[PDB]
């Protein structure tokens, strides 16, 4: 086509979606990771994660307001990945990289799994 | 912080949100623009438009599944702006610029109003 494109649009959209999350505006699901609870927007979770895409495209699961993750999932790892979904920034540290990578494999977030693998390889 | 950032994340999120819109997945509102109907995600509309942000933060309107726009709004202008919200690309043409600018003023989409004003000024 002959469209023009606003370079910062996608980043500005994501920033506003994170502001809605902050302010608990139109959040429509609670993700439970053992004793912790995280509120989010199903559409953002599906856009970032192959696991959430599969969950919320299922004709029964699409209607659930609570999703319980596998008990082996680390809440801090999940929190770091949820923040990445809404900001593009990943708080990857020596002390959390193993939990983050395991969580990203479970959630099916291939670019995160890729940077974790590279950071681990560099320390070996 | 000491975060790393994935450059393409925001663009990839927006592309996936447009794929959900295409496939009518988790759309939760119908915008009516006279005889036409447009299905969308409230969160994407709020992230892009000051008018939708005000509508869906209202304690009564947040619960509506149908929103009727002012009868003066042009459906083609709205369609072009809805596509821009989900893609960052604006199909601005000599034949639609006046309707697009009027619609963007109503929807409170300041960057669009800005490029329309500039394109109009250049032709004068």
């Amino acid at each position: 086509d002959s469209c023009i494109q606003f370079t910062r649009h996608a980043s500005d959209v994501l920033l506003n979606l994170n502001r809605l999350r902050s302010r608990d505006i139109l959040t429509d699901v609670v993700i439970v990771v053992s004793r912790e609870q995280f509120r989010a927007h199903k559409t953002v979770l599906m856009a970032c994660s192959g696991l959430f895409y599969s969950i919320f495209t299922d004709q029964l699961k699409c209607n659930l307001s609570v999703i319980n993750l596998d008990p082996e999932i680390n809440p801090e790892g999940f929190c770091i990945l949820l923040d990445f979904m809404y900001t593009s920034r990943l708080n990857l540290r020596e002390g959390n990289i193993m939990a983050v990578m395991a969580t990203a494999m479970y959630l099916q977030m291939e670019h995160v799994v890729d940077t974790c693998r590279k950071f681990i390889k560099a320390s070996e | 912080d000491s975060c790393i950032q994935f450059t393409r994340h925001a663009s990839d999120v927006l592309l996936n949100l447009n794929r959900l819109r295409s496939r009518d997945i988790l759309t939760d509102v119908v915008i009516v623009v006279s005889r036409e109907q447009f299905r969308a995600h409230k969160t994407v509309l709020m992230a892009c438009s000051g008018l939708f942000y005000s509508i869906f933060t209202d304690q009564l309107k947040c619960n509506l599944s149908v929103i009727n726009l002012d009868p003066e709004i042009n459906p083609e202008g709205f369609c072009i702006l809805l596509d821009f919200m989900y893609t960052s690309r604006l199909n601005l043409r000599e034949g639609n610029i006046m309707a697009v600018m009027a619609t963007a003023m109503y929807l409170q989409m300041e960057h669009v109003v800005d490029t329309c004003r500039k394109f109009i000024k250049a032709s004068e």
């Binding site: 494109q5 606003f6 | 690309r89 604006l90 960057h111």
Partner: peptide
């Protein structure tokens, strides 16, 4: 704004 740019030409994509």
């Amino acid at each position: 704004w740019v030409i994509p």
